[PDB]
Tab-separated table of N, CA and C and ligand atoms in Angstrom:
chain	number	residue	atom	x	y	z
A	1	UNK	N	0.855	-1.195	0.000
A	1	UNK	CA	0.000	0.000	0.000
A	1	UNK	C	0.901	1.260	0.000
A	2	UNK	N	0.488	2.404	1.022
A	2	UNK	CA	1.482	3.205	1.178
A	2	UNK	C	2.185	3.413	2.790
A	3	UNK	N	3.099	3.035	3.211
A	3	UNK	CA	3.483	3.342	4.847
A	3	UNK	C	5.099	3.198	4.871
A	4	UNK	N	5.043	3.384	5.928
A	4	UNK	CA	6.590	4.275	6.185
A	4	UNK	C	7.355	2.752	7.227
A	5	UNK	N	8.843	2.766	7.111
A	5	UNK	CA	9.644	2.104	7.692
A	5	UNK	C	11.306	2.342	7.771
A	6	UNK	N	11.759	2.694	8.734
A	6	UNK	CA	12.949	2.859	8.525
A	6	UNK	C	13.524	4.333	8.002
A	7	UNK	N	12.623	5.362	8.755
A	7	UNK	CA	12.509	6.696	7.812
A	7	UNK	C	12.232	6.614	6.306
A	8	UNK	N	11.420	5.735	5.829
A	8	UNK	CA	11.238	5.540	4.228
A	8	UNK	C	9.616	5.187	4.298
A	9	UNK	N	9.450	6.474	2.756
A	9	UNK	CA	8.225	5.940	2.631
A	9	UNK	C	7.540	4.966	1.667
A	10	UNK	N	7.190	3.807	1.545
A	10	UNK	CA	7.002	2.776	0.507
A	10	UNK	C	6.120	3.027	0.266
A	11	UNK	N	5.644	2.239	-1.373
A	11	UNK	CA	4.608	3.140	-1.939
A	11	UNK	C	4.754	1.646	-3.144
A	12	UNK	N	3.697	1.025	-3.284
A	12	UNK	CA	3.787	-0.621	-3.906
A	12	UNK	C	3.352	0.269	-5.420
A	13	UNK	N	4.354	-0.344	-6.079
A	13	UNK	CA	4.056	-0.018	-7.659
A	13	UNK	C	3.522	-1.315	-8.171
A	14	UNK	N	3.816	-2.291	-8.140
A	14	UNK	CA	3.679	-3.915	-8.792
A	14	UNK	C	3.353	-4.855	-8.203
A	15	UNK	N	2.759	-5.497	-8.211
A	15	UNK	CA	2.455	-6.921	-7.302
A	15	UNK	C	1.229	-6.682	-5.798
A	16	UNK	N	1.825	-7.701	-5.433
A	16	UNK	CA	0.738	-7.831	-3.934
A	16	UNK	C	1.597	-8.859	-3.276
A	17	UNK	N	0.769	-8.771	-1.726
A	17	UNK	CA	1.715	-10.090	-0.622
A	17	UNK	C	0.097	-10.361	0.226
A	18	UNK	N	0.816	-11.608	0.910
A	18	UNK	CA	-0.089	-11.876	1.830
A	18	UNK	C	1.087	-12.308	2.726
A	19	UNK	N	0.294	-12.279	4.179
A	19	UNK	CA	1.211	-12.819	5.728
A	19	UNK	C	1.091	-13.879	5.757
A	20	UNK	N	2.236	-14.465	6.350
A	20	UNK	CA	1.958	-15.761	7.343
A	20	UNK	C	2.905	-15.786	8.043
A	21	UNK	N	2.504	-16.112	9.617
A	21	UNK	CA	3.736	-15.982	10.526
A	21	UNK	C	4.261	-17.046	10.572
A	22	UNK	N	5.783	-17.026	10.739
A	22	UNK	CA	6.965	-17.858	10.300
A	22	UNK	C	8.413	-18.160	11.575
A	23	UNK	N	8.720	-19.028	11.692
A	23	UNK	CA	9.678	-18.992	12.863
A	23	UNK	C	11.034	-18.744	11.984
A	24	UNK	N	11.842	-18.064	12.307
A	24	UNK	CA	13.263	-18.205	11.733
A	24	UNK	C	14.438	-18.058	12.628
A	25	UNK	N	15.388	-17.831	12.271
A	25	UNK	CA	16.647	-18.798	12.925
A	25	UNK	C	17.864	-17.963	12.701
A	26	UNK	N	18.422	-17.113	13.952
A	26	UNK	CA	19.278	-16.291	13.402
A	26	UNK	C	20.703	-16.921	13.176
A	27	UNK	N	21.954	-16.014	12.853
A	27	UNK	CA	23.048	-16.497	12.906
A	27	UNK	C	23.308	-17.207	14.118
A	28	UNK	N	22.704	-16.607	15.319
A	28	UNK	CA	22.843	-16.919	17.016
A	28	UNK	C	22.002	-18.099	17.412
A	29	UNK	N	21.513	-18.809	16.571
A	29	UNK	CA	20.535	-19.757	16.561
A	29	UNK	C	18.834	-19.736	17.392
A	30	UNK	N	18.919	-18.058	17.492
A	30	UNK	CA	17.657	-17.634	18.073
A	30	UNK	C	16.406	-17.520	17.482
A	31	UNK	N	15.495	-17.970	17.827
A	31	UNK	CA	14.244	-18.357	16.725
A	31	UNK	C	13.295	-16.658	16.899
A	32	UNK	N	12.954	-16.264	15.957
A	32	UNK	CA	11.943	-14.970	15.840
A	32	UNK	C	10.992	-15.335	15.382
A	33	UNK	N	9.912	-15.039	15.613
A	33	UNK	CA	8.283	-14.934	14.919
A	33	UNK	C	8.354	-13.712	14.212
A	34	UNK	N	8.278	-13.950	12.883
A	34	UNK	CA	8.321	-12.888	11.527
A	34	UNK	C	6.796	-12.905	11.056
A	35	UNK	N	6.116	-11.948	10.525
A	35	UNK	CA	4.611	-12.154	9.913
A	35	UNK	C	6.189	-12.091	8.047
A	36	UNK	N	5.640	-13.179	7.676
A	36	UNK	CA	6.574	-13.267	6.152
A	36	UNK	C	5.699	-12.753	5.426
A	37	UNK	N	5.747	-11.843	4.502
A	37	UNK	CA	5.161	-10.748	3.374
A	37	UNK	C	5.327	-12.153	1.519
A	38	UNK	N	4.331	-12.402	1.793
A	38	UNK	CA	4.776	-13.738	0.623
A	38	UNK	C	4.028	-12.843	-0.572
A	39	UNK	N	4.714	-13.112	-2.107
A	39	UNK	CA	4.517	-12.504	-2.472
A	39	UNK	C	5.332	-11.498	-3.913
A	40	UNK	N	5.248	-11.537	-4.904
A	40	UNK	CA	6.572	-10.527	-5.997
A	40	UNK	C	6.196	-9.554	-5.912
A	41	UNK	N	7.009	-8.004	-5.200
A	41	UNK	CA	6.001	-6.909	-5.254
A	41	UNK	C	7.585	-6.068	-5.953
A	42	UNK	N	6.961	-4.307	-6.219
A	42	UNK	CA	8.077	-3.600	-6.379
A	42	UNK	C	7.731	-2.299	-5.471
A	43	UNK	N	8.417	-1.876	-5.207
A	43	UNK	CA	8.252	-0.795	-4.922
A	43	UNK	C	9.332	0.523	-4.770
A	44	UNK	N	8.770	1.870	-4.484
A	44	UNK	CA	9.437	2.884	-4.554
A	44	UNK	C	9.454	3.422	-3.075
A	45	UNK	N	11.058	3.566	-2.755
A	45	UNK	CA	11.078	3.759	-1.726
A	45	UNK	C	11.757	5.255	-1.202
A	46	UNK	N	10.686	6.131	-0.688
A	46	UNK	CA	11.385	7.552	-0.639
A	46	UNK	C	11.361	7.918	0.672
A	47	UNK	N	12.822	8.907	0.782
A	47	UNK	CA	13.808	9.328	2.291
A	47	UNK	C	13.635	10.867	1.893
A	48	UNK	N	14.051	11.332	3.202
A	48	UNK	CA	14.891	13.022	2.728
A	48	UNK	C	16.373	13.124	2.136
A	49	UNK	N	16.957	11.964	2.215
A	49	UNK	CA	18.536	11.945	1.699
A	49	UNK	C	18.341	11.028	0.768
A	50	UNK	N	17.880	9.619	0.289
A	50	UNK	CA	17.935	8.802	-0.424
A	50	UNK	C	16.494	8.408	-1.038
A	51	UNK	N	16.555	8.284	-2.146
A	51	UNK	CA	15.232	7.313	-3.495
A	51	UNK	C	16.219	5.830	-3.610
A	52	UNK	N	15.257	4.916	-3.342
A	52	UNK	CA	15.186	3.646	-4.452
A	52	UNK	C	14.148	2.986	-4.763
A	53	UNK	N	14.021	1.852	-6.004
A	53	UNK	CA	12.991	1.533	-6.278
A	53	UNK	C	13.704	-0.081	-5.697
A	54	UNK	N	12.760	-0.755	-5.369
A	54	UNK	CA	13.085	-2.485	-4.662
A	54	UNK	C	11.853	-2.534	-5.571
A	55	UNK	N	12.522	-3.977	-6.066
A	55	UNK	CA	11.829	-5.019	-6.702
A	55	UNK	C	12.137	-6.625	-5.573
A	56	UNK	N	11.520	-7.175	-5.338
A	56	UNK	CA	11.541	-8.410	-4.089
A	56	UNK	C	10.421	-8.940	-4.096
A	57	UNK	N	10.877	-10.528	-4.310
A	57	UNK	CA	9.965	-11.573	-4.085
A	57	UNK	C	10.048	-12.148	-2.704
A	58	UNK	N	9.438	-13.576	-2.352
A	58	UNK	CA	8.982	-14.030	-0.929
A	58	UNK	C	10.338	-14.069	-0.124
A	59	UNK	N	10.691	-13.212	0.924
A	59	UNK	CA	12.193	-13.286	1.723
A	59	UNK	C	13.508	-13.447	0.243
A	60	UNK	N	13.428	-12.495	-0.825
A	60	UNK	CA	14.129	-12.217	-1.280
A	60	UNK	C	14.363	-11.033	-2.125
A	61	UNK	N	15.542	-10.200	-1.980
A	61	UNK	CA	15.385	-9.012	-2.837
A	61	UNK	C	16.040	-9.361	-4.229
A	62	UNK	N	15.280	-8.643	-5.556
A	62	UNK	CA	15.899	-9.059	-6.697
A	62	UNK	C	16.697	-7.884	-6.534
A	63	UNK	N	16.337	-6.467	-6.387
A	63	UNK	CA	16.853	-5.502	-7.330
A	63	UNK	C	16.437	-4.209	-6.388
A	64	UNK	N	17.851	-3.660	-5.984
A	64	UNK	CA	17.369	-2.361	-5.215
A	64	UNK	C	17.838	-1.225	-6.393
A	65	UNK	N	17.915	-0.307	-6.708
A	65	UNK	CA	18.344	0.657	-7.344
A	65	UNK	C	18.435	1.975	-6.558
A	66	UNK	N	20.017	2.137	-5.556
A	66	UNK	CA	19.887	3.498	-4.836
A	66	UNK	C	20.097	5.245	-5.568
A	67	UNK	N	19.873	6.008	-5.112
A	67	UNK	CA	20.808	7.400	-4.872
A	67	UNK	C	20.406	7.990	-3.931
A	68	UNK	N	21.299	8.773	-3.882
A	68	UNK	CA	21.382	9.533	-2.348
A	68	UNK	C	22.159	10.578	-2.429
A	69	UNK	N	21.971	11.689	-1.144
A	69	UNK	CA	22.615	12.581	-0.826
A	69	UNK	C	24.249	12.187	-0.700
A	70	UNK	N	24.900	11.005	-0.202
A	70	UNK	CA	25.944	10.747	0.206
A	70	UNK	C	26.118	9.177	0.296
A	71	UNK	N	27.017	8.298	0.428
A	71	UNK	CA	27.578	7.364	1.193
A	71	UNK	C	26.694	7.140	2.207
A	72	UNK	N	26.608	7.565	2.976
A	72	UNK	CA	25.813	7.358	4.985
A	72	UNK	C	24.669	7.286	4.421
A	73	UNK	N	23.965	7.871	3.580
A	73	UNK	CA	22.398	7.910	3.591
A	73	UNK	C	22.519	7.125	2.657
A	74	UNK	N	22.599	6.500	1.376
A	74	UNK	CA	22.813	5.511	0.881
A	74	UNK	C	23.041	4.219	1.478
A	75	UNK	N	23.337	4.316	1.978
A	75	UNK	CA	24.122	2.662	2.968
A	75	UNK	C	22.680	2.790	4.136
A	76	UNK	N	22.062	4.172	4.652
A	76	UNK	CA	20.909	3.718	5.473
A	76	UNK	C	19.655	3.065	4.653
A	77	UNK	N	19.275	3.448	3.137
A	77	UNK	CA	18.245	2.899	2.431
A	77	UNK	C	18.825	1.484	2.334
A	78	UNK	N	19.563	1.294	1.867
A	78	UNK	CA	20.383	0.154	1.401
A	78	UNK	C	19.979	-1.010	2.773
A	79	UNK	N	20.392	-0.615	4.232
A	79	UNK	CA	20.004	-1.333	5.086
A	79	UNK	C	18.492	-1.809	5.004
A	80	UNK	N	17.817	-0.562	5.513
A	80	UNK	CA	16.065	-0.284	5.161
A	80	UNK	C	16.012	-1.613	4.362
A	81	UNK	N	16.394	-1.605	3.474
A	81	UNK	CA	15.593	-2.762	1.760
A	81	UNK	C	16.180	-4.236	2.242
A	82	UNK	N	17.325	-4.235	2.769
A	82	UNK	CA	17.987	-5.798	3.552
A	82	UNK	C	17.275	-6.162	4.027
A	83	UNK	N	16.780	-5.269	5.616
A	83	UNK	CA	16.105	-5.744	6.511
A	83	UNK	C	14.539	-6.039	5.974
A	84	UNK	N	14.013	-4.952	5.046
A	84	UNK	CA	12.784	-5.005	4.830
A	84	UNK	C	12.387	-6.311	3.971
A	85	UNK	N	13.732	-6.773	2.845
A	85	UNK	CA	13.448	-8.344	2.291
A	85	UNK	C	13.227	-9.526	3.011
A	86	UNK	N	13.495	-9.437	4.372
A	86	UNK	CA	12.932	-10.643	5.528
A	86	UNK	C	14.075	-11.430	4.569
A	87	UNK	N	15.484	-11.529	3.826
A	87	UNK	CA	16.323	-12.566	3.794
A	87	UNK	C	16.446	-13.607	4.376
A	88	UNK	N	17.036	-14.350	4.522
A	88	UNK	CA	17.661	-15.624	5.141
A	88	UNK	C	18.878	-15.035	5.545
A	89	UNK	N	19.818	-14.670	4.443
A	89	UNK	CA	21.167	-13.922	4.793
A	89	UNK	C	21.496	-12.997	5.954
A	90	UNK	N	20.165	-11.622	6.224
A	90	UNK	CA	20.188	-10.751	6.768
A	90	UNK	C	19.680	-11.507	8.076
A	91	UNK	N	18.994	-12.225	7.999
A	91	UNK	CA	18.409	-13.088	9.571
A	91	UNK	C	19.598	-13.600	10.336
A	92	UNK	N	20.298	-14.757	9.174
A	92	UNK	CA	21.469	-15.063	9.690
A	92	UNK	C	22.454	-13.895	10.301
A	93	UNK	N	23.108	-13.131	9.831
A	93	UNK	CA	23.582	-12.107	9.924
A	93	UNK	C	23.663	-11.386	11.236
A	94	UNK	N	22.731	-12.209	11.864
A	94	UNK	CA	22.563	-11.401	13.283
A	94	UNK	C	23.058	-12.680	14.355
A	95	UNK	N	24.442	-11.726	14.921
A	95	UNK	CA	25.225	-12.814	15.197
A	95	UNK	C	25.062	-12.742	16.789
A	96	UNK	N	24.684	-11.775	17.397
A	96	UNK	CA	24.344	-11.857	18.884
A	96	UNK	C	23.282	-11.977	19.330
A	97	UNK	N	22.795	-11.910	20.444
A	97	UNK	CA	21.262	-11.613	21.272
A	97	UNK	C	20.710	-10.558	20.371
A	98	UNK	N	19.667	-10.854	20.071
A	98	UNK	CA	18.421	-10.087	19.776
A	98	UNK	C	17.697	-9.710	21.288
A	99	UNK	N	17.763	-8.722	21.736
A	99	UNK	CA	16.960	-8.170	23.130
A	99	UNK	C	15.459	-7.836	23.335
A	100	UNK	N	14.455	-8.847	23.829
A	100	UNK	CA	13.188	-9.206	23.715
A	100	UNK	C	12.911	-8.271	24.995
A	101	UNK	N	13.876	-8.703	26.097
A	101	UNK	CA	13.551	-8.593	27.446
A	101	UNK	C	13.634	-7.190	27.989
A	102	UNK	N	14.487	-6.185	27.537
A	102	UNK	CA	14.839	-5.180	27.984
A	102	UNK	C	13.733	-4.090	27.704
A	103	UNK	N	13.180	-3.146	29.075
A	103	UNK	CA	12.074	-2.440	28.830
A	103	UNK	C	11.924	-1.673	27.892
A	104	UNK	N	13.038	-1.266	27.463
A	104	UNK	CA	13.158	-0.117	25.698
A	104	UNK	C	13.116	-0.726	24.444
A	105	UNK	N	12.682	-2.051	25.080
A	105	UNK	CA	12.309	-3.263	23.552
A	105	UNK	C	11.195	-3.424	23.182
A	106	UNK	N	10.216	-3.559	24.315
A	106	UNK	CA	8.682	-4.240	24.453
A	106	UNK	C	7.750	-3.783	23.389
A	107	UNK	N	8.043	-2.537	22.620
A	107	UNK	CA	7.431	-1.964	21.967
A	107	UNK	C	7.952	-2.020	20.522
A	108	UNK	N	8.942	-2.898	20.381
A	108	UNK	CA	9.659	-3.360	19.057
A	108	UNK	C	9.360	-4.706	18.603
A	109	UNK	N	8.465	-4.953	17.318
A	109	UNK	CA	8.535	-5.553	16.913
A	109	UNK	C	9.735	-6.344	16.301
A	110	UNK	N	9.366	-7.648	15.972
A	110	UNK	CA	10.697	-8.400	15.349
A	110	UNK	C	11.500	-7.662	14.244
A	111	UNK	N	10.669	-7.046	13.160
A	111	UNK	CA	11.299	-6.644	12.373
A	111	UNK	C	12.054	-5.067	12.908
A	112	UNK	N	11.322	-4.435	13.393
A	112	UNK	CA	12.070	-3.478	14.019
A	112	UNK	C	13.293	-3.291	14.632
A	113	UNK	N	13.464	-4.766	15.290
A	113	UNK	CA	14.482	-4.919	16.304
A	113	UNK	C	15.514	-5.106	15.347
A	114	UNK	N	15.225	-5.984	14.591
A	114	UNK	CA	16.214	-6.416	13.210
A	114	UNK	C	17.075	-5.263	12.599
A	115	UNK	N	15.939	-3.790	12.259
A	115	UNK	CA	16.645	-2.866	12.015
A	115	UNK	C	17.278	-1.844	12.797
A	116	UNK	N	16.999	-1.839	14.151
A	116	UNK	CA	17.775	-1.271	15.153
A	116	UNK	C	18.837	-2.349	14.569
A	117	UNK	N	19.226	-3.576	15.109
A	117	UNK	CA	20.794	-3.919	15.225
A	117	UNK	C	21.533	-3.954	14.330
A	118	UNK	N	21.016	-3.550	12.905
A	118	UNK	CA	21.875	-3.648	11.552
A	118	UNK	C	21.891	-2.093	11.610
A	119	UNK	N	21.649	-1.334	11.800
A	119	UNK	CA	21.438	0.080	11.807
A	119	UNK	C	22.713	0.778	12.696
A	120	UNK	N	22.681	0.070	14.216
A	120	UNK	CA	23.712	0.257	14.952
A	120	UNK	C	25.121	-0.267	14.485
A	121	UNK	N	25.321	-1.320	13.681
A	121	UNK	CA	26.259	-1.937	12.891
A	121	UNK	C	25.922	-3.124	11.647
A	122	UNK	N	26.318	-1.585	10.835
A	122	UNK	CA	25.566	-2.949	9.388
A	122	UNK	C	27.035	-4.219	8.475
A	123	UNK	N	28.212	-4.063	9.050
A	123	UNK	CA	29.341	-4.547	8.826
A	123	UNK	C	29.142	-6.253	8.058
A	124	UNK	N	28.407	-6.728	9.571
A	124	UNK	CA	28.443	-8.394	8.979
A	124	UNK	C	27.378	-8.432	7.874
A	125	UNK	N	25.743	-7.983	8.247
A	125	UNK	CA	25.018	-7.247	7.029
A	125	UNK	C	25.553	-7.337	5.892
A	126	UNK	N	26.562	-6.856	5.829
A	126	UNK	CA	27.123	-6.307	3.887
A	126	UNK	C	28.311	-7.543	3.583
A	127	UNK	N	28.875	-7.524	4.476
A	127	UNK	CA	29.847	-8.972	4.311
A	127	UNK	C	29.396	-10.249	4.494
A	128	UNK	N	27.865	-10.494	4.432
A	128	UNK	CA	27.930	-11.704	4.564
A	128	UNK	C	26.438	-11.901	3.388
A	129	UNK	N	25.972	-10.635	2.375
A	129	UNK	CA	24.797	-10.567	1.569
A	129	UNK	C	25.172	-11.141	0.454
A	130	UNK	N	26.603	-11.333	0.271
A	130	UNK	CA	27.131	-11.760	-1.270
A	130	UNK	C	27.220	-10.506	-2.391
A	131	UNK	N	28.285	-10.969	-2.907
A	131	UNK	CA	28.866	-9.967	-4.344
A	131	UNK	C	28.925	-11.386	-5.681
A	132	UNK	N	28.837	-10.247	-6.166
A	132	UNK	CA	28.325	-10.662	-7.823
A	132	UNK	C	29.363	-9.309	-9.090
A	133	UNK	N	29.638	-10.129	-10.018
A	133	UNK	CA	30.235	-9.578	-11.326
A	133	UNK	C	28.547	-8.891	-11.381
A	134	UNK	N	28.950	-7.196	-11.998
A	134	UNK	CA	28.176	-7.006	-12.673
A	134	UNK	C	28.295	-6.447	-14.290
A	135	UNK	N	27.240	-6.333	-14.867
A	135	UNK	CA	26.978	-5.825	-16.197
A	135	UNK	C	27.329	-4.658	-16.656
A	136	UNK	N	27.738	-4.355	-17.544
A	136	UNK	CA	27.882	-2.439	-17.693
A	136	UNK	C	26.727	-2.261	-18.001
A	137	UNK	N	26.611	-1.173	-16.813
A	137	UNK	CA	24.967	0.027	-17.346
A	137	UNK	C	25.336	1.238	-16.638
A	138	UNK	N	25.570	2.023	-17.884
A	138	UNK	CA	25.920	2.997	-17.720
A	138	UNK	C	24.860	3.573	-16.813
A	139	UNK	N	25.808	4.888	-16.043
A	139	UNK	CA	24.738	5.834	-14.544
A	139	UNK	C	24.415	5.050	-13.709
A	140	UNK	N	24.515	3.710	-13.786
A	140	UNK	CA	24.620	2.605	-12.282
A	140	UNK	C	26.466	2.116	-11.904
A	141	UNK	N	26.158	2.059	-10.560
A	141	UNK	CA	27.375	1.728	-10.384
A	141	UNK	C	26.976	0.727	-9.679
A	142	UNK	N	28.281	-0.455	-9.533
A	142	UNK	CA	28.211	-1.642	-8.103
A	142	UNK	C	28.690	-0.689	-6.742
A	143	UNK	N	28.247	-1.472	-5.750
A	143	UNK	CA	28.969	-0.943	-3.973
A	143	UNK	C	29.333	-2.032	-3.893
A	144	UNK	N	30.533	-2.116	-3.335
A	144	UNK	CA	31.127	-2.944	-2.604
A	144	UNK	C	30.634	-3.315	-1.007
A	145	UNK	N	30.810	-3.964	-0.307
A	145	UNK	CA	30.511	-4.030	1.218
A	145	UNK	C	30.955	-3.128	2.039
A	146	UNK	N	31.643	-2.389	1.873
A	146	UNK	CA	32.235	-1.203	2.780
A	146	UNK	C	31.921	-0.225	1.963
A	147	UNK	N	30.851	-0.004	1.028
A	147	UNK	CA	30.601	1.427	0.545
A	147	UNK	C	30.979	2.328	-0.315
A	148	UNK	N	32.452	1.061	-0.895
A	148	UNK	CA	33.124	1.883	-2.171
A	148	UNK	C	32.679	1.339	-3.461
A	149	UNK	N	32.406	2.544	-4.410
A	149	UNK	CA	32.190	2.357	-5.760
A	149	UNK	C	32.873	0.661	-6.279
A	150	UNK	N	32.084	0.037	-7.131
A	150	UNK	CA	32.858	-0.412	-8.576
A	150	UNK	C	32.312	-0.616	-9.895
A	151	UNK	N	33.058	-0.627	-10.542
A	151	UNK	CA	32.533	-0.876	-11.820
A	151	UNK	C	32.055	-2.602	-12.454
A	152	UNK	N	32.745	-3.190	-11.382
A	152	UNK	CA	33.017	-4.615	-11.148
A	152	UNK	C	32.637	-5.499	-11.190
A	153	UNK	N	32.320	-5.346	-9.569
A	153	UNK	CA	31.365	-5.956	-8.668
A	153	UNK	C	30.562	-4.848	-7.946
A	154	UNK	N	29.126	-6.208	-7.609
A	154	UNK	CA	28.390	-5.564	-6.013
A	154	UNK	C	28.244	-6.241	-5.421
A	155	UNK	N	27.047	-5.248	-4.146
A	155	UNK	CA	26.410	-6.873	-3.145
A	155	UNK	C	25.328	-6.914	-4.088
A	156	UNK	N	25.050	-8.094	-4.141
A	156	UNK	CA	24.171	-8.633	-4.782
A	156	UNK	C	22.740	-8.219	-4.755
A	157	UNK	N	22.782	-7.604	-6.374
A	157	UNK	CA	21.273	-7.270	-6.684
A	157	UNK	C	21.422	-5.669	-6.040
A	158	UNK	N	22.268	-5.190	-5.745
A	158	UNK	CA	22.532	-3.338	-5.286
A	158	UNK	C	22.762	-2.611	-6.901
A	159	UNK	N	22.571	-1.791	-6.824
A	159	UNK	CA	22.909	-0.714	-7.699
A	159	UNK	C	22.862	0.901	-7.478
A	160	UNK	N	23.981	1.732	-7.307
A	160	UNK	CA	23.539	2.978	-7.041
A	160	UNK	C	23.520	3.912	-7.750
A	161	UNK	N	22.843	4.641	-8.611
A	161	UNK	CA	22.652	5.813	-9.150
A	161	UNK	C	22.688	6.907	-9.112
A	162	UNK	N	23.518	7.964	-10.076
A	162	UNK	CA	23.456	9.351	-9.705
A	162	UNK	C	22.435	9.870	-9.646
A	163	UNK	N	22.268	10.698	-8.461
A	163	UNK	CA	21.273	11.814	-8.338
A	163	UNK	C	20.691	12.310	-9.488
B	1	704	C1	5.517	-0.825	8.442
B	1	704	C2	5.308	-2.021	7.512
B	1	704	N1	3.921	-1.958	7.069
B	1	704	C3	3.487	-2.632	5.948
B	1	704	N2	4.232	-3.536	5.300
B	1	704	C4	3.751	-4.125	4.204
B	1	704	C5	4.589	-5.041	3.444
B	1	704	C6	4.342	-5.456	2.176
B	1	704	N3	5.345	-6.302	1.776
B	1	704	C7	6.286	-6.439	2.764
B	1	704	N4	7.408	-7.138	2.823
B	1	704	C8	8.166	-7.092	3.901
B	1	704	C9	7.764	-6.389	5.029
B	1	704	CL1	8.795	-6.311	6.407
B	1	704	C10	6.610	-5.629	5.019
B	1	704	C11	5.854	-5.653	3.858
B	1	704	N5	2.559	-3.817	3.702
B	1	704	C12	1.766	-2.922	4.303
B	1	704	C13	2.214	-2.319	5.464
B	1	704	F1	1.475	-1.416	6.130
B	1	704	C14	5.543	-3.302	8.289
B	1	704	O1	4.568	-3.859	8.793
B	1	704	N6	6.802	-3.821	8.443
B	1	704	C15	8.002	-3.193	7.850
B	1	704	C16	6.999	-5.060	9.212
């Protein structure tokens, strides 16, 4: 539909989903109750520093396409669309306690919590999403996992665009 996550406002251009709640299994071997968004949708996703459009099927992203004001705000949409694909990768990825118990939690949903701790450090996040050779297309570039340009490679299924 149209609603906001992660300072971003989504806005479904293509497709549809339906829920079903799902147990999953982090890197830490901690089980979460996820409502899973099943489903091929696309959408456009708008910030005050960063636009992209996500294309993503059931717990997978095909195709983010960023730009941004900078690096930092780029790499925050970029998180936003990880966490928001409900991955396997990005689940895994979470290599410590997830904090259920603590009173400044109670009001965080699973997915929320997900993007608090990739938010506070998105490191293993990007090093552990996979890189891929990409294609020349011109005005897209690959990111690397630490945020630098290539012409190369990316993480997989990223692309960032000039303003
Ligand atoms: C705020 C957002 N609200 C909505 N999310 C969705 C939605 C569609 N496909 C999705 N795929 C993944 C996730 Cl994660 C959420 C969605 N649709 C309508 C909404 F009000 C939400 O519930 N989450 C980010 C958990």
């Amino acid at each position: 539909s149209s609603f906001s996550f992660g300072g971003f406002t989504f806005k479904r251009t293509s497709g549809s989903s339906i829920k079903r709640e799902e147990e999953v299994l982090t890197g830490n071997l901690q089980t979460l109750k996820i409502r899973v968004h099943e489903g091929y949708e696309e959408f456009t996703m708008v910030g005050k520093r960063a636009t992209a459009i996500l294309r993503k099927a059931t717990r997978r992203l095909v195709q983010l396409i960023v730009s941004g004001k900078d690096e930092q705000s780029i790499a925050e949409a970029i998180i936003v669309a990880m966490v928001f694909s409900q991955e396997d990768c990005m689940i895994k990825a979470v290599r410590g306690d997830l904090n259920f118990v603590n009173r400044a939690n109670q009001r965080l949903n699973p997915m929320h919590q997900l993007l608090r701790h990739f938010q506070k450090d998105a490191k293993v996040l990007f090093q552990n999403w996979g890189i891929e050779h990409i294609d020349n297309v011109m005005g897209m570039v690959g990111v690397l996992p630490d945020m630098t340009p290539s012409t190369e490679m990316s993480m997989r299924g990223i692309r960032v665009s000039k303003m």
